[PDB]
Amino acid sequence: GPTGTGESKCPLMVKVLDAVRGSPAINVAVHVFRKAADDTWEPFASGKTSESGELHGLTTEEEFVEGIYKVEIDTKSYWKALGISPMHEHAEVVFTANDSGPRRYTIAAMLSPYSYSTTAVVTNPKE
Template structure:
């Protein structure tokens, strides 16, 4: 129950962040087509220093690494991709959850968490992926908004 409540709070925070004014910290998200936000469900706090890698599926069904990054102290990754790099297609984001939990002094079940999604199927969009982590489970959601002009 507590995890479900934390996830609802995370999701509602994401919706509020989408309408953030330009002068707010992290407001560069408005111009970045893919953003990531991670919450540690055990601490009820952002999950900082989680490594992630973004792949795009090629015509031959193989995965090409596009970019990588780490979450900051606020559990966020900004400016992962430019509009030019975020072309229509199928993407996979792999989160190194095992290393995160090891750094927290905890054993975990999953080696990694993965999110696979199709981008821009209905025109240009802005995507925010949210990940709620615990050592033996993870939950994801996405906020998909209109692309900026």
């Protein structure tokens, strides 16, 4: 997919990559939800990202909605797996349809840095 059509295929896909190097993140806990008629968060999908920045299995008929989706990523367990430096606050994606005018339906999440530590040094949790 060279220059030209810089868009996705599926109706809803999750894209998680480490801004540290710009590469995709592997084994990244992700949970997708939808805006319920009661103004609540309903379960839309869930799983772990891939080295291709895509997550298969989350796709469902639920995608046939207004467009409101809430994807949450858990980096706390992502840095504990690869022993990566600590973060500040997980990144989430919450957008509503019929608001402004969205184009792509892919969730772009970058695990940007949040400290000075560079060298990959394994560390223990808060406990």
